[PDB]
Structure 1
Amino acid sequence: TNVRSRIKDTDFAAETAALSKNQVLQQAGTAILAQANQLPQAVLSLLR
């Protein structure tokens, strides 16, 4: 059961770190696309 524990289980102190990371990466990427999809709006400020 020790062996199967180290194989099959997850230590949640690691998991929650992975979660915090991934959540930051998503909220980031979303907020990034808020800008990437607005950089083409600099176009029609020029000559329109």
Structure 2
Amino acid sequence: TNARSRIKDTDFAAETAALSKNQVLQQAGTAILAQANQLPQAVLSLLR
């Protein structure tokens, strides 16, 4: 049984950190996109 856990039993005290990292990335790349999609808007609004 102890083996069965060493196989399966996630050391989620580490995977929590991994988890935050993923949540974090979702957030960050999103905000980057909210910024990114403003670029072409500016380009044309000005050249016009």
Q: Aligned partners of 1:28 and 1:19: how far apart in 2?
A: 14
Q: TM-score, normalised by structure 1?
A: 0.83
Q: CA RMSD in A?
A: 1.1
Q: TM-score, normalised by structure 2?
A: 0.83
Indicate the percent of aligned positions where both proteins have the same amino acid.
Answer: 98
Q: Aligned partners of 1:47 and 1:38: how far apart in 2?
A: 15
What 5-or-longer segments of structure 1 have no aligned partner? none
Deviations, residues 1-48 of structure 1 (Å, cap 9, x unaligned): 111111011112111111110011000011000111011112123321
Aligned pair count reads 48
